[PDB]
Amino acid sequence: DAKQQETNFAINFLMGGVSAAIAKTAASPIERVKILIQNQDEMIKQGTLDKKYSGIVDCFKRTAKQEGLISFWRGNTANVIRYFPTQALNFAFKDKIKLMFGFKKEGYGKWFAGNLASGGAAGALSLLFVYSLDFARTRLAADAKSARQFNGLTDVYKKTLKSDGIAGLYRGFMPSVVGIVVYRGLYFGMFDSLKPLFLASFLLGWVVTTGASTCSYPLDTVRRRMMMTSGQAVKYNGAIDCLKKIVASEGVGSLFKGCGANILRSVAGAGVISMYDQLQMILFGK
Numbered sequence: 001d002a003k004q005q006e007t008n009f010a011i012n013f014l015m016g017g018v019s020a021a022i023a024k025t026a027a028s029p030i031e032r033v034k035i036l037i038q039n040q041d042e043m044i045k046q047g048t049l050d051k052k053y054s055g056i057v058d059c060f061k062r063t064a065k066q067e068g069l070i071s072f073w074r075g076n077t078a079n080v081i082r083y084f085p086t087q088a089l090n091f092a093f094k095d096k097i098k099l100m101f102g103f104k105k106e107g108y109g110k111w112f113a114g115n116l117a118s119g120g121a122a123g124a125l126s127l128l129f130v131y132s133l134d135f136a137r138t139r140l141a142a143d144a145k146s147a148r149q150f151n152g153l154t155d156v157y158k159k160t161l162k163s164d165g166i167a168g169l170y171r172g173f174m175p176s177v178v179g180i181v182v183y184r185g186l187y188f189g190m191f192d193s194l195k196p197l198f199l200a201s202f203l204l205g206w207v208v209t210t211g212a213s214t215c216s217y218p219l220d221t222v223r224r225r226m227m228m229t230s231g232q233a234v235k236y237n238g239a240i241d242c243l244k245k246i247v248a249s250e251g252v253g254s255l256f257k258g259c260g261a262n263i264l265r266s267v268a269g270a271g272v273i274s275m276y277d278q279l280q281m282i283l284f285g286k
Protein backbone atom coordinates (compact mmCIF):
# COMPACT_ATOMS: atom_id res chain seq x y z
CA ASP A 1 0.00 0.00 0.00
CA ALA A 2 2.82 2.39 -0.92
CA LYS A 3 0.48 4.41 -3.14
CA GLN A 4 -1.95 4.75 -0.23
CA GLN A 5 0.92 6.02 1.91
CA GLU A 6 1.78 8.54 -0.81
CA THR A 7 -1.84 9.73 -0.86
CA ASN A 8 -1.82 9.94 2.94
CA PHE A 9 1.34 12.04 2.95
CA ALA A 10 -0.13 14.24 0.22
CA ILE A 11 -3.35 14.93 2.12
CA ASN A 12 -1.39 15.51 5.33
CA PHE A 13 0.82 18.04 3.54
CA LEU A 14 -2.00 20.00 1.88
CA MET A 15 -4.29 20.10 4.91
CA GLY A 16 -1.29 21.16 6.98
CA GLY A 17 -1.01 24.21 4.75
CA VAL A 18 -4.65 25.06 5.40
CA SER A 19 -4.12 24.84 9.16
CA ALA A 20 -1.07 27.11 8.92
CA ALA A 21 -2.89 29.54 6.62
CA ILE A 22 -5.80 30.06 9.01
CA ALA A 23 -3.53 30.37 12.06
CA LYS A 24 -1.39 33.06 10.44
CA THR A 25 -4.37 34.86 8.91
CA ALA A 26 -6.16 35.08 12.26
CA ALA A 27 -3.24 36.75 14.03
CA SER A 28 -2.27 38.78 10.96
CA PRO A 29 -3.51 42.21 12.15
CA ILE A 30 -1.58 41.97 15.44
CA GLU A 31 1.42 40.81 13.39
CA ARG A 32 1.43 43.94 11.22
CA VAL A 33 1.06 46.08 14.35
CA LYS A 34 4.22 44.40 15.65
CA ILE A 35 6.09 45.13 12.41
CA LEU A 36 4.87 48.74 12.39
CA ILE A 37 5.91 49.47 15.98
CA GLN A 38 9.19 47.58 15.55
CA ASN A 39 10.35 49.44 12.43
CA GLN A 40 8.71 52.83 13.01
CA ASP A 41 12.05 54.62 13.30
CA GLU A 42 13.02 53.35 9.85
CA MET A 43 9.72 54.68 8.50
CA ILE A 44 10.25 58.06 10.17
CA LYS A 45 13.65 58.35 8.47
CA GLN A 46 12.17 57.30 5.12
CA GLY A 47 9.37 59.82 5.68
CA THR A 48 6.69 57.13 5.50
CA LEU A 49 5.59 57.80 9.08
CA ASP A 50 4.66 61.21 10.49
CA LYS A 51 4.80 60.65 14.25
CA LYS A 52 6.07 57.77 16.39
CA TYR A 53 3.47 55.22 17.49
CA SER A 54 2.47 55.79 21.12
CA GLY A 55 1.68 52.10 21.51
CA ILE A 56 -0.30 49.08 20.36
CA VAL A 57 -3.69 50.78 20.70
CA ASP A 58 -2.42 53.89 18.92
CA CYS A 59 -0.99 51.73 16.14
CA PHE A 60 -4.33 49.98 15.67
CA LYS A 61 -6.33 53.22 15.59
CA ARG A 62 -4.07 55.13 13.19
CA THR A 63 -3.67 52.24 10.75
CA ALA A 64 -7.40 51.50 10.70
CA LYS A 65 -8.45 55.13 10.25
CA GLN A 66 -5.93 55.98 7.52
CA GLU A 67 -5.93 52.77 5.47
CA GLY A 68 -8.90 50.68 6.59
CA LEU A 69 -9.63 47.29 8.14
CA ILE A 70 -8.43 45.06 5.29
CA SER A 71 -4.99 46.70 5.39
CA PHE A 72 -4.20 44.71 8.54
CA TRP A 73 -3.76 41.63 6.34
CA ARG A 74 -1.28 43.33 4.01
CA GLY A 75 1.52 40.85 3.32
CA ASN A 76 -0.36 37.79 4.58
CA THR A 77 0.01 35.92 1.27
CA ALA A 78 3.74 35.59 1.94
CA ASN A 79 2.95 33.77 5.19
CA VAL A 80 0.46 31.56 3.34
CA ILE A 81 2.87 30.60 0.56
CA ARG A 82 5.89 30.15 2.84
CA TYR A 83 4.49 26.93 4.35
CA PHE A 84 4.95 24.68 1.32
CA PRO A 85 8.61 25.34 0.48
CA THR A 86 9.45 25.26 4.19
CA GLN A 87 7.73 21.99 5.06
CA ALA A 88 8.93 20.37 1.83
CA LEU A 89 12.46 21.23 2.93
CA ASN A 90 11.53 20.22 6.47
CA PHE A 91 10.32 16.75 5.51
CA ALA A 92 13.29 16.31 3.17
CA PHE A 93 16.49 17.42 4.88
CA LYS A 94 15.83 18.23 8.55
CA ASP A 95 16.14 14.61 9.69
CA LYS A 96 19.40 14.06 7.80
CA ILE A 97 20.93 17.15 9.39
CA LYS A 98 19.83 15.85 12.80
CA LEU A 99 21.54 12.56 11.96
CA MET A 100 24.64 14.49 10.91
CA PHE A 101 25.26 16.86 13.83
CA GLY A 102 23.19 15.16 16.53
CA PHE A 103 24.13 13.21 19.64
CA LYS A 104 21.84 10.85 21.58
CA LYS A 105 20.13 12.58 24.50
CA GLU A 106 20.60 9.54 26.74
CA GLY A 107 25.06 13.78 27.72
CA TYR A 108 22.82 16.84 27.87
CA GLY A 109 25.65 19.23 27.04
CA LYS A 110 26.68 17.37 23.90
CA TRP A 111 23.02 17.03 22.91
CA PHE A 112 22.51 20.75 23.47
CA ALA A 113 25.37 21.71 21.15
CA GLY A 114 24.14 19.16 18.61
CA ASN A 115 20.66 20.68 18.64
CA LEU A 116 22.08 24.13 17.91
CA ALA A 117 24.09 22.92 14.93
CA SER A 118 21.14 20.89 13.62
CA GLY A 119 18.63 23.69 14.17
CA GLY A 120 20.97 26.30 12.73
CA ALA A 121 21.81 24.32 9.60
CA ALA A 122 18.17 23.39 8.97
CA GLY A 123 17.07 26.98 9.54
CA ALA A 124 19.77 28.43 7.29
CA LEU A 125 19.20 25.86 4.54
CA SER A 126 15.47 26.57 4.63
CA LEU A 127 16.01 30.33 4.63
CA LEU A 128 17.99 29.98 1.39
CA PHE A 129 14.68 29.42 -0.39
CA VAL A 130 12.38 31.03 2.18
CA TYR A 131 13.91 34.34 3.33
CA SER A 132 12.60 36.27 0.31
CA LEU A 133 9.01 35.68 1.41
CA ASP A 134 9.58 36.94 4.96
CA PHE A 135 11.29 40.02 3.54
CA ALA A 136 8.32 40.85 1.30
CA ARG A 137 6.01 40.25 4.27
CA THR A 138 7.79 42.85 6.40
CA ARG A 139 8.09 45.43 3.61
CA LEU A 140 4.41 45.13 2.70
CA ALA A 141 3.45 45.45 6.36
CA ALA A 142 5.70 48.50 6.64
CA ASP A 143 4.89 50.77 3.69
CA ALA A 144 1.95 53.04 4.47
CA LYS A 145 0.13 56.02 2.99
CA SER A 146 1.22 59.41 4.34
CA ALA A 147 1.19 57.17 -1.56
CA ARG A 148 2.35 53.60 -0.95
CA GLN A 149 5.91 52.53 -1.76
CA PHE A 150 4.91 49.11 -3.10
CA ASN A 151 1.91 48.14 -5.24
CA GLY A 152 1.89 44.53 -4.05
CA LEU A 153 3.83 41.37 -3.23
CA THR A 154 5.45 40.93 -6.63
CA ASP A 155 5.99 44.69 -6.89
CA VAL A 156 8.35 44.42 -3.92
CA TYR A 157 10.46 41.87 -5.81
CA LYS A 158 10.68 44.00 -8.97
CA LYS A 159 11.65 47.24 -7.24
CA THR A 160 14.06 45.61 -4.78
CA LEU A 161 15.88 43.67 -7.51
CA LYS A 162 16.06 46.76 -9.73
CA SER A 163 17.67 48.79 -6.94
CA ASP A 164 19.79 46.39 -4.87
CA GLY A 165 19.55 43.09 -6.73
CA ILE A 166 19.30 39.68 -5.06
CA ALA A 167 21.23 41.04 -2.07
CA GLY A 168 18.35 43.36 -1.21
CA LEU A 169 16.00 40.41 -0.83
CA TYR A 170 18.33 38.75 1.68
CA ARG A 171 18.89 41.65 4.08
CA GLY A 172 19.49 40.50 7.64
CA PHE A 173 20.26 36.86 6.89
CA MET A 174 23.05 36.55 9.47
CA PRO A 175 21.13 37.91 12.49
CA SER A 176 18.18 35.74 11.41
CA VAL A 177 20.23 32.53 11.46
CA VAL A 178 21.85 33.46 14.78
CA GLY A 179 18.36 34.32 15.97
CA ILE A 180 17.16 30.82 15.08
CA VAL A 181 20.02 29.25 17.04
CA VAL A 182 19.55 31.48 20.10
CA TYR A 183 15.77 31.02 20.06
CA ARG A 184 16.14 27.24 19.76
CA GLY A 185 18.76 26.94 22.49
CA LEU A 186 16.68 29.09 24.82
CA TYR A 187 13.52 27.18 23.90
CA PHE A 188 14.87 23.68 24.55
CA GLY A 189 16.91 24.79 27.55
CA MET A 190 13.96 26.48 29.24
CA PHE A 191 11.53 23.71 28.28
CA ASP A 192 13.60 20.84 29.70
CA SER A 193 14.33 22.75 32.91
CA LEU A 194 10.65 23.47 33.53
CA LYS A 195 9.54 20.07 32.21
CA PRO A 196 9.36 18.17 35.53
CA LEU A 197 7.27 21.01 36.99
CA PHE A 198 -4.27 20.70 29.14
CA LEU A 199 -4.21 24.08 30.88
CA ALA A 200 -0.86 23.44 32.56
CA SER A 201 0.60 22.18 29.28
CA PHE A 202 -0.66 25.21 27.35
CA LEU A 203 0.64 27.62 30.00
CA LEU A 204 3.99 25.83 29.96
CA GLY A 205 4.31 26.22 26.20
CA TRP A 206 3.41 29.90 26.37
CA VAL A 207 6.03 30.66 29.03
CA VAL A 208 8.88 29.00 27.11
CA THR A 209 7.79 30.62 23.83
CA THR A 210 7.56 34.06 25.44
CA GLY A 211 10.95 33.80 27.14
CA ALA A 212 12.94 32.43 24.21
CA SER A 213 11.48 34.90 21.71
CA THR A 214 11.91 37.90 24.02
CA CYS A 215 15.62 37.35 24.61
CA SER A 216 16.23 36.71 20.91
CA TYR A 217 14.05 39.68 19.94
CA PRO A 218 16.85 42.25 19.47
CA LEU A 219 18.19 39.97 16.72
CA ASP A 220 14.73 40.00 15.12
CA THR A 221 14.56 43.80 15.33
CA VAL A 222 17.93 44.21 13.61
CA ARG A 223 16.85 41.74 10.92
CA ARG A 224 13.64 43.62 10.12
CA ARG A 225 15.32 47.04 10.28
CA MET A 226 17.93 45.78 7.81
CA MET A 227 15.06 44.76 5.53
CA MET A 228 13.85 48.37 5.72
CA THR A 229 17.17 49.65 4.40
CA SER A 230 16.74 47.72 1.16
CA GLY A 231 16.34 50.20 -1.69
CA GLN A 232 17.27 53.06 0.63
CA ALA A 233 20.25 55.39 0.21
CA VAL A 234 21.79 54.65 3.61
CA LYS A 235 22.33 51.10 4.88
CA TYR A 236 23.92 49.58 7.98
CA ASN A 237 27.32 47.92 7.59
CA GLY A 238 26.12 44.71 9.22
CA ALA A 239 23.89 43.59 12.07
CA ILE A 240 26.54 44.54 14.62
CA ASP A 241 26.90 47.95 12.98
CA CYS A 242 23.11 48.19 12.98
CA LEU A 243 22.99 47.14 16.63
CA LYS A 244 25.62 49.73 17.61
CA LYS A 245 23.88 52.60 15.80
CA ILE A 246 20.47 51.74 17.27
CA VAL A 247 21.72 51.79 20.86
CA ALA A 248 23.74 54.97 20.33
CA SER A 249 20.82 56.79 18.72
CA GLU A 250 17.67 55.45 20.38
CA GLY A 251 18.91 53.29 23.26
CA VAL A 252 18.73 49.59 24.10
CA GLY A 253 14.97 49.75 24.62
CA SER A 254 14.48 50.50 20.92
CA LEU A 255 15.51 46.90 20.23
CA PHE A 256 12.43 45.70 22.09
CA LYS A 257 9.84 47.69 20.13
CA GLY A 258 6.88 45.45 19.35
CA CYS A 259 7.99 42.69 21.71
CA GLY A 260 4.76 42.87 23.69
CA ALA A 261 2.78 42.94 20.45
CA ASN A 262 4.64 39.77 19.46
CA ILE A 263 3.60 38.01 22.67
CA LEU A 264 -0.03 38.86 21.93
CA ARG A 265 0.48 37.46 18.43
CA SER A 266 1.78 34.22 19.96
CA VAL A 267 -1.27 33.59 22.16
CA ALA A 268 -3.51 34.49 19.22
CA GLY A 269 -1.83 31.94 16.94
CA ALA A 270 -1.77 29.25 19.62
CA GLY A 271 -5.38 30.07 20.48
CA VAL A 272 -6.82 29.85 16.97
CA ILE A 273 -4.84 26.71 16.10
CA SER A 274 -6.37 24.96 19.12
CA MET A 275 -9.86 26.08 18.12
CA TYR A 276 -9.33 24.85 14.56
CA ASP A 277 -8.03 21.53 15.88
CA GLN A 278 -11.37 21.00 17.62
CA LEU A 279 -13.20 22.02 14.44
CA GLN A 280 -10.98 19.68 12.43
CA MET A 281 -11.64 16.92 14.95
CA ILE A 282 -15.36 17.17 14.21
CA LEU A 283 -15.30 17.37 10.41
CA PHE A 284 -12.38 15.01 9.77
CA GLY A 285 -11.24 12.01 11.80
CA LYS A 286 -7.91 13.61 12.68
Ligand SMILES: C=C1[C@@H]2CC[C@H]3[C@]4(C)C[C@H](O[C@@H]5O[C@H](CO)[C@@H](OS(=O)(=O)O)[C@H](OS(=O)(=O)O)[C@H]5OC(=O)CC(C)C)CC(C(=O)O)(C(=O)O)[C@H]4CC[C@]3(C2)[C@H]1O
Nearest residue numbers: 086090123126127130175176179180183184216219220223
Ligand atom coordinates in the same frame (compact mmCIF):
# COMPACT_ATOMS: atom_id res chain seq x y z
C1 LIG B 1 15.93 36.64 14.79
C2 LIG B 1 14.72 36.13 14.84
C3 LIG B 1 13.97 35.91 16.11
C4 LIG B 1 14.34 34.56 16.68
C5 LIG B 1 14.29 33.45 15.63
C6 LIG B 1 13.19 33.56 14.55
C7 LIG B 1 12.07 32.53 14.76
C8 LIG B 1 11.51 32.58 16.18
C9 LIG B 1 12.71 31.17 14.56
C10 LIG B 1 11.69 30.04 14.55
O1 LIG B 1 12.39 28.82 14.33
C11 LIG B 1 11.60 27.66 14.56
O2 LIG B 1 11.94 27.12 15.84
C12 LIG B 1 11.21 25.94 16.16
C13 LIG B 1 11.54 25.51 17.58
O3 LIG B 1 12.96 25.39 17.73
C14 LIG B 1 11.56 24.85 15.15
O4 LIG B 1 10.82 23.66 15.44
S1 LIG B 1 11.55 22.34 15.68
O5 LIG B 1 12.78 22.30 14.85
O6 LIG B 1 10.67 21.21 15.29
O7 LIG B 1 11.91 22.21 17.11
C15 LIG B 1 11.24 25.31 13.74
O8 LIG B 1 11.73 24.34 12.82
S2 LIG B 1 10.79 23.73 11.77
O9 LIG B 1 11.53 22.69 11.01
O10 LIG B 1 9.63 23.11 12.45
O11 LIG B 1 10.32 24.78 10.84
C16 LIG B 1 11.89 26.66 13.45
O12 LIG B 1 11.39 27.19 12.23
C17 LIG B 1 12.40 27.21 11.18
O13 LIG B 1 13.58 27.12 11.49
C18 LIG B 1 12.00 27.36 9.74
C19 LIG B 1 12.63 28.62 9.16
C20 LIG B 1 12.12 28.90 7.75
C21 LIG B 1 12.40 29.83 10.06
C22 LIG B 1 10.70 30.27 13.41
C23 LIG B 1 9.97 31.60 13.53
C24 LIG B 1 8.92 31.48 14.62
O14 LIG B 1 8.49 32.48 15.23
O15 LIG B 1 8.48 30.33 14.87
C25 LIG B 1 9.25 31.83 12.23
O16 LIG B 1 9.93 31.97 11.20
O17 LIG B 1 8.00 31.86 12.23
C26 LIG B 1 11.01 32.73 13.67
C27 LIG B 1 10.43 34.15 13.74
C28 LIG B 1 11.53 35.13 13.37
C29 LIG B 1 12.75 35.01 14.28
C30 LIG B 1 12.55 35.77 15.59
C31 LIG B 1 13.95 35.70 13.64
O18 LIG B 1 13.52 36.84 12.89
